Write a protein that binds this DNA or RNA. Sequence first.
DNA 1: ATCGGCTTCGCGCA
DNA 2: TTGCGCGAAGCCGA
Length: 460
Amino acid sequence: IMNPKRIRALKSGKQGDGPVVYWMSRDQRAEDNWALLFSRAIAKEANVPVVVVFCLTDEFLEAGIRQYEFMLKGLQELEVSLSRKKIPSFFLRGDPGEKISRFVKDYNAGTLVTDFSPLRIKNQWIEKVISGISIPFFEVDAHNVVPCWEASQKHEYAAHTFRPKLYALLPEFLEEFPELEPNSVTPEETLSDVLETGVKALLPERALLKNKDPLFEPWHFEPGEKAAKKVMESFIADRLDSYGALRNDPTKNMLSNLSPYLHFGQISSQRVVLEVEKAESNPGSKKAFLDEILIWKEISDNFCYYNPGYDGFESFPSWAKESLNAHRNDVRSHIYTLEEFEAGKTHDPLWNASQMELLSTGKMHGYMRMYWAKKILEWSESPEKALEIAICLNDRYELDGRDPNGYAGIAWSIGGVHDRAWGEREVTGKIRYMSYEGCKRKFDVKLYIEKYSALDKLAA
DNA sequence: ATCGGCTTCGCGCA
DNA sequence: TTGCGCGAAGCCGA
Ligand SMILES: Cc1cc2c(cc1C)N(C[C@H](O)[C@H](O)[C@H](O)COP(=O)(O)OP(=O)(O)OC[C@H]1O[C@@H](n3cnc4c(N)ncnc43)[C@H](O)[C@@H]1O)c1[nH]c(=O)[nH]c(=O)c1N2
């Protein structure tokens, strides 16, 4: 039994006789999952087993092997984890609107549950699934602490507007997780080949170095529920105490390193928050970190949920479009094309340094993300093209890419969504400016450049 | 209300 | 480096 404001009736309906079916999507984990926890609870009152069903869409050919393997190795571990609680896992392979709604038929499912994403394509799928199922259809926010549609019913203009609203809801929703009770009813293709198949598809596209070896180094983030925990734990032990004072230094590995895990659902951020809240470190440090994993993460959901064009110019706030529109004819000092950005071929060795961190590691430092996308706007031929170029490089190369945090962060950087207006520059209007020189007062830039020094020539 | 306060940007200056 | 103030800037919301 759990908080019901975590649930939303999609298709009002009458209960079916068969298994309760969890259509997993965003939250790829067995522990700390309110979606799976609710489907087990309604599975228990109907005395049916609960099964999980995952769909593998052809969206993987938009990304690279790095994302596809991180997740495929992640699913492979969950699969063993679900089986131990007697919950079988089914892996469909196609377009969900057709595939889920015909799984529901072939399987006589009693009722249907999914997790919550604000991305446009998921909602498109749901309404397809809804039109073609008889059984009721339930939705659970397992990704935010406070449910997106409960935190605030409108678009939030800034962190300080949303921050009260979220924090007066924290006592009621920041609670611990119960246990996933294993199935008691035991019930009636393979992830190996699907990985081999998908890798073969993506190989022609891999990002190589001149010497025909790949760029991406797969050893900075082991994928999986197990590996994620040892990251959250090492963070609370080694880094959190100094997080607030070094969050902004791209030479200190002092971030949480959590975002590939949170993105794929491999760890609950509600578990993190519990574990930070009880953990005993710098009060300033906890407050800075909680503002990121709580306020900034869950507002980025608030962004895409209430702004369908979250990845377009029209989503920017009224003043910001006015400013960029005023400066559309200004002569840019430089203009680069996508693949020149991609290949680290700017005049700015600090900018190429971080492009190099993105290519080789799959995670750009969070301070260097704000700079990277501001310099794209400043050296691209138009607002729209900057956006386009930045999303394409983010989602193609970030492990945490294709995520509401990506868009709301790109919108923040380029269009100022969730930000204020600043002193008026040429080209970038009133958009918050960051300078190379700003980064020199904050951290030894020569060390950052030095680290990824000798990848540009080695991968030209 | 109508005036403070805002992811803490950048750069002077000590 | 590293705080601390000051400048330029639009608007939510109490
Ligand atoms: C241009 C640009 C591009 C991106 C992003 C921001 C910007 C400015 N972000 C957000 C942020 O850069 C990223 O979430 C963290 O750096 C991920 O690293 P850590 O988890 O180590 O962060 P860290 O430990 O500092 O923070 C912990 C968590 O806080 C959240 N968080 C931090 N900064 C945030 C931000 N500005 N917006 C939203 N949530 C935030 C994340 O969930 C993050 O994992 C993003 N994030 C992401 O998950 N996927 C993406 O594709 C992108 N892309």
